[model samples]
Target chain A: NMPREQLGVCAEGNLHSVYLMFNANDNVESQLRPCIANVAQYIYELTDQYSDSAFNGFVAIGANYWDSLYPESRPEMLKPFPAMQEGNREAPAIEYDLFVHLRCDRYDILHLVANEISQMFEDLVELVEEERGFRFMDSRDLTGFVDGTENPKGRHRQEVALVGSEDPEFKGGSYIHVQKYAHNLSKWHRLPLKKQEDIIGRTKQDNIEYESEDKPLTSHIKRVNLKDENGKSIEILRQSMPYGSLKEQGLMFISTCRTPDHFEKMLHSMVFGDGAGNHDHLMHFTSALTGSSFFAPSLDFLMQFDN
Target chain B: NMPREQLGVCAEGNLHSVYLMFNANDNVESQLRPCIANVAQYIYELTDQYSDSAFNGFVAIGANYWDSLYPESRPEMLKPFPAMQEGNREAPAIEYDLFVHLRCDRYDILHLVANEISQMFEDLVELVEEERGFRFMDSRDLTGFVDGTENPKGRHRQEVALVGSEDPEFKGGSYIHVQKYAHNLSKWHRLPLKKQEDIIGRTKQDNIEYESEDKPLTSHIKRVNLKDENGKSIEILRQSMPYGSLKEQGLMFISTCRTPDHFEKMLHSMVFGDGAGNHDHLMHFTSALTGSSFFAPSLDFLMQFDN
Candidate 1:
């Protein structure tokens, strides 16, 4: 009854996506709760039906939602994101009760899925934010650098993002962090090519990583390529997407991890630095405008709350 | 001797490009003239050296420059653009004395070429505008529709874009019209899938054109897919590119034609309806911010101007 296989932990699609955030209204637990589980099931079925068409949808409950729905049992690591500060950059977490990620090879499918979900929740919840994202140029960030270059693969991804027996009730679930960054492209574009490469810690054209000797301590890679005391890299499953217009541009950085500690440590390093005065040089051109964290429970866990 | 073969009329590249506009300052004709010729030659040679890398460059002189340099001779259709008015939307032409287009598979080459030209023209001419453009997703527009879909193929491209014996003095040259359009993507994204398809006159899923009977008269494709009285489709060679940030987004619509008539008629149809009152619905979501017209003369003709 877990329906663990139905969870969309690694939904891959290109072209179009929409990240929707929602907050439950007063009547959510009674009238609204009945349809919430059906909504998840519908989205799961829709994803399955449209998988070959590269359409998929995923739903996640925020820390607040978990507290309200399952007060008896909760994931140990689940909690609201605290404020993050590093150097001159600060990221504040904005909490929401529910989050949905819709993606497809075409905008129409994403639109369809988003529309269906919105219609179902229209009376029960208030739509907080909807960020439309696109896959730009072979997964390159808006700043022309290749993104997610060091992402975990295959089994490694599960090892990094999925829950284990530490929280038996929420096993197979994942904790996710979301942040919206706005890039100062005019300033970034004017920077010298090598300077930009040095900040990103990779070649722009070929996306080749620099050797440790060549990579700067303040580079983005050095900040986010976090490691544990054993000298092994700590990883997260990322699904960041690019979104913006001429007036503003930036990235929606998404990370799903087995424990929130992985993302929290990396965020601290990126903002506060690694016990040094140095911070990510990317901070000079990119500003984090919004941040939030949520917990995605297995389908069976969600169904219990639904029933 | 005229380096006609060295001209970049048909130069092909991908990845990145810049459209640079310049106006003559006080010392342009004297100080700028010498370096202008050298700059032209430099771009020609650079294109040749980087041909295997799919890099190319082209330069065009505006009507103002033609008037100042070659006071006696001028192309029949050489002039500045006039204001364009539709039912509610209007587009005005912005003039510049010179234009340069640099294209390469890598941004570094374009940056290098643009930098060198800017340095040479620093005192002689002032750069009025520089629009950095890039190829996005299977040559599609920012709105996800396939662009330049009906471009003439093979020899037809030359037929559409290059001047012939009819313009004997400027034969082998081309006339170009450039416009920068800023898309109101937020408003565009709010439209329903089918309604957006109707406005674009294509299926959003696969970029397929609607049947003639089902196509709306105000759809973008219907407005621009113009034909003459004899039912022969009039064409222009397009090298449009997508550029923008999160705040503003849009297309740089570029057209090179054997004569200005092709582009003029298409523009007229798009902004002002052809007898009918149905202007392109796309105009509602995209604003034409700037427009310019220029003549890229044959290498021999440009050399004579140089002398």
Candidate 2:
């Protein structure tokens, strides 16, 4: 997460972003190397071009792993299968796409970098799907759904986010929940706000949440908050960006937290639900196309590339 | 991610925003409940009051899971651990705080949000320590080096970026990656660029790659790309952001891809290496403090919210 002091720069704002998925069905080892190298080249050049006139300027491009697309072991992080899946019963081969993200306040530079990157990694098309491509930005999607609406505000300026708001320690840390919500605009627009609110459990006119005080513990926020250990509770901070357009686009929900249970309990509560199967009201309107979780550190701690 | 053609209204060109951290630790569960409700109320009010009025609007906010703190089974998605981990341990207890992040183009709004959010989460803070906090940006923290110098360019308007440049099937999609790197600035600065270059396997000025074209079957990038059954290759797009300050900030790397395995294999090589100890030269210099991963979809996908 970026610091409050540097949070909003009129021209350029630093952003933390990411994209994740399962691999293509026919993914092979031979087709891997150059794809990464090309990406590396793009990152190398991008960072170079966007000089951090800000003393704190720098960029890091790294990667990690997640078990599977249909992660049954951790049902909480999994979502409904993508519509693209032939059977819809099996997970798509999204595990193959490479993810790239950057943080900086050089707005024009981001545009330039995005252009150069598009050129550098242009060849990746054939590898994945000729029609399926990549996404950029640090927010959810081009659709304009501001995610992470309930994220906890960071308090400890230098100490990254943490789990349960339980510990009396770090106040700034957060639990991030990232997902790629593929838009079914035809369907979404089809449903009016009343229907949408029922699906989302919130009002659309003002984006005000349903009063959980009187509602069943089934509300997404209430349902999740109910399972918290101490009054500690669960909270997630989202820093998702946009990608794609009319046809394709979604969010990269990146959550930061001190404990996995805060969200696990909440998500699990949603799908399977604590009471009846009323958990995923979000599913009423939104489908869990792709989902994942992440932790974010404080900027100060980040400076130490290696401990 | 936001689409190029439709990034107006909320698009601020470039931005430098801050995320606020808070501890909803003090109040009773019931009080905390309504208080959080109240906080959300305020945010909703603010957003409603400020929507479409700024160069860059506050896109969103979200809540996350507590259990996903220390990577349990899905370990790869974790970002480098944040410093100030009380005792620097894995999955440290968040002194327990609420986190609020605002994406705006104006610094005044950040100040406003900071103060407003501080007041919003006030009841939760047990003591002064549990009060509000903040941080900045950096992209170098996650990947031991610079980031976003070469990114994708332009929206669909004129054709600065190609259809298949980043992702294939998704016309507007691009690969994104997010990694958290801790800064050892003093040490990093102590070492000359030459030494730093060796560790990063690149030059400082020109951003030239290590020319690992023939370094071995397991050079960094070579080990990460994905391949198809027919021997074709898949690609990943890279985007990143930075957090913290000159004395402290680092990187929060984000990447997008059409495949996940390519990156999985690559990460394995970096951490575990290819049957050798020469994994990542910068590993020792920098630390894999935290890790997390996710899959991002197109904007159409996000708007669908639920499918």
Candidate 3:
């Protein structure tokens, strides 16, 4: 069973992601842990009875947060997100300490749950960014590509997303990375369907994975398709959603993985290119405005802070 | 008896405004007139027969458009929109030759109609701005103040909006002024409800208008409540709507009137103040980015070009 049932697990519904940075206050660890536990308890009770509700989240400690609070066993990979610049395009890293993920079948319920979380953290935290995301038609990105097409499924999902024996204390926990990419839809819309398909490496009307040899190395799909030394694909659980108004459009890109290594390698390939001149061509249209990494412990581990 | 049934006339429903500037092509007048007439015919037929559909629009000539097309009957007040600067805030003027306003009960119909217009003018126009506006809660702005509360009703609407006999040839037509004001809603929300009410000079809960004496001189209501030399209230028909994402919020402030005089006086008061330093304090939070003026002629006058 997934340690946090709903937190990092993929499920049906729209998402509301609230990313927070701790404000300067005394007794942060003493104050934050209880606040999170209290909020999670409320959500847990509500979602346990309601089939349509789910709330799960992660807390990624920055250098400062770890130095002050969890100095005993800070995750080896946990640190500030590094800003990456590839040619002219820049992916800036914006650090944050906490991220609360809320989901539900309907917008009103998700809003109510998010409001409760916001109220609970009102005094103790500063809002780094808050994005309310919705599932586009057929679970597609706003650019019309079917999202998470290659996500690990069933037993594989748990294997891909959960930590194991290597991390004794944080077993069942996972590494989480969140980024917001704003799409220049006007330019994307101007292209023909065929041209769009070429850029996406997928059909617009139907979601189909292209054969590896046929896919362009510069396409988004090709850049992020990572594999291990034995040529086995390294998988990650993706929870991405589109969010914006008519003029401003974007995607809230969130991924959970067993280790940070899988995510880091894929991102480095996409942004810096795999030692080739080819960068992910999608970066021309979608620019990452904010990026951060967090660690979500299992519910059992999180529950230890209740006292 | 409106110039073009629904053009500039306020009504229930969401609005989709397509603002355009003519591309520099040879004989713009010869090519543009027929194209407008063709699109107008489609809109007229759709709105007349469909219960849920209504489409009406206006064509305003900028200085450049007038110089190349019809110069003989240019409205006396028709000129380039002047950029107004007060203190540190600057309201810029962007010139455009046409403004097409469409409103409908449903987004589907509006989108279909707007798509048709976009397709028709795709080659011959540069889109200046396109905004999809919805009637906010209780007919108020997103900022929680009642919108157009003091708008003229019935006969007064025509008196304020339609040109009269003095401008014989353009008697049935009206002058239009459009401005886009971006609001700092975060700052706005930070103010207490009582302070907000005082700034707007209306109760936020019930939208009750404050007494003239009680209203602050620097209030938005007081600045726009203008009078003529004879003490007659100078008025205009306003059709404003809020449009934005969660991060960016603002209103599309549109005004139609018999002459630009009424709009100019009110705007001058807001930006430059009333012979004193007491400018409308609302400008501190709501800054205008784009401004333009157009003259919308009567349907009878527009139809003459059909041949």
Candidate 4:
């Protein structure tokens, strides 16, 4: 049987989203099963009502909390968030029990859906954090750069994000890593335009990447864009967006894939750099405030708990 | 000459906005005159470049900060925020020195513009607060009710928002009041759908207001929709929008008018209630965290400081 519907559907995103986190309340564990059932049904209803807004939602269980909830089985590659640090740069691990990723073109609809989720799970879980993100200008980051420009379009999205035959029983499940980064825009803005471009590995005005020979080892693109020893490209389906308000604002970095290796290796390159020690220079202007590891079991598998 | 161009132009709004606040650096007052000069021109240039995003911006000087900066003259009705509290509800005053109201359909453009504002005023002023707002579905509030339904349309917007013959010298200026509200979604959502409809005095699905006889005395619509003793309607152009993430999120309440009396009276009606003590019951769902009073001077008057 196929995994949850989200593996294939949610890969196509919306203009706005709510990244909701929750910690399961142990006192009401028995009643929590039906809550998931109710949520899935409610999301389906919402998707119908907001057909024009491109509405979609998905459920994900925290890596550490997975075994406690499902006890029967777990995704083979599921693991706790891999915390990383190099010198002053760091990506801290901050775990939660559950997460609801809801998206829609209409911001208010997401608000309504999130509120409903809280109401349904009000007794079984405590909501710890939520972030409403939007498509910035041309889907660019707040730093005036883009990531989805060359994204694998069409069928590749599902291939990249969903588990396949390698994990036959857990087919369609996906691993997700999330982080909240707060930017020091003042320091970043102080740099000359060209210097900023050098750090990002692109032209600021046009968002064009520098030619291969002109690429800096410390540039953001150079550090994160990688290939395995076999010459195969390491890939992850990014669902990141710009988030927060004026006092503290930055990107909500999200990665979903069949395995966690790519995300970890990318973090390693960004933080520790290569053997030559050339870190992603863009890290100097922002710091990750939170990190989480989660695996979304297939919709087919998730329903089994509803009973 | 007429007041600043913003008075005549900014009446038409955009989908996204950045409500930015700044407090002047006391030691740097000498450098501020030219800074305002730079900002006015910058805003005009931005308006041109982002014409497709419906980009528009305006400047407002705080009531208390007016004399310190301009000293020459002021909008006649300008005053500090009228803080009002009745029982557990309160509209507390939290003042600032300068306010830049920037709007656009593109979120990133607002970020870029705000950053520019911060850059130019870096030494002379400090950015204290920034709220990025977006139009919630069909111009509804977080509570899923519409306010702009009966708003002054087209030319009436200018008539309601811009100072006229009553204050000739400041004819192209406007008085604006701002407040930040945090909503208690749990309490509001706990109410039955009918109860919510009664509280808002409108149908949730169609956004249709109740007939006069069906409107409750304490309903949100009943409290603030008012007229003067002379039977003339008191009016203001509302440019409100929802803000923030999961934590501390609600409407960035804004009002721009030719005079402050209308806004003050509306507040009085909502907080103090009528002779029968029918306060706006909707106030129970949200509380104002910050409030400020300011007047946006005419573009012409602002550029004089360019020297």
Q: Among these predicted structures, which one has the highest DockQ?
A: 4
Q: Candidate 2 on A283-303: residue-level lDDT in tens?
A: 443444554333222232222
DockQ ranking, high to low? 4, 3, 1, 2
Per-model DockQ: 0.05, 0.02, 0.07, 0.43
lDDT at B305, model 1: 40
Model 3 chain B: ten consecutive residues of lowest lDDT: B10-19
Local distance difference test scores for all models: 0.77, 0.38, 0.68, 0.81
| Model 1 per-residue lDDT tens digits across residues B1-307 | 2226225565543666778898887645755555666777778788778776577777888866777756677888887775688565777888889998888775545655676677667567777877667666567777777887788778777778888888687887888888899987667878999999999899976889999999899988999998789998988988888764333558988888888878888888888865678888899998988888888776666655444
Native RMSD of candidate 2 (Å): 23.8
For model 3, residues B1-307, the per-residue Cα lDDT tens digits are 3245324443333433433444445555766676776666665566665454454445554544655655556666766676688686677888676777666544335544565576676466665566656555556676878788888777777778878776766767777788888887767878999889888888987889999989998899999999898998888898777654333557888888888868888888888988877888888788787888777666555555642
The residue ranges of model 2 lying beyond 4 angstroms of the native Cα positions read: A1-99, A103-108, A114-146, A156-177, A214-219, A223-227, A292-307, B1-307
Report the error of model 4 at residue A165, Å.
2.6
Q: Can you write out model 4's per-residue Cα lDDT over B117-140, one digit (the tens) per residue?
A: 877786788788877777777777
The positional error of residue B205 in candidate 4, measured at the CA in angstroms, is 4.9
Off by over 4 Å in 1: A5-80, A89-150, A165-172, A179-234, A240-253, A274-290, A296-307, B1-76, B89-150, B164-173, B178-234, B238-253, B269-307
Instruction: Give each candidate's fraction of reference contacts reproduced.
Output: 0.00, 0.00, 0.00, 0.42
Cα error, candidate 1, residue B155 (Å): 1.7
Please say which candidate is ahead in DockQ: 1 or 2. 1
What tens digits encode model 2's per-residue C-alpha lDDT throughout B162-200?
123244323332222234455555456568777776666
Question: How big is the positional error of residue A59 in model 3, measured in Å on the Cα after superposition?
Answer: 7.8
Ordered from best to worst lDDT, the candidate numbers read 4, 1, 3, 2
Off by over 4 Å in 4: A5-10, A44-48, A189-214, B5-10, B189-216
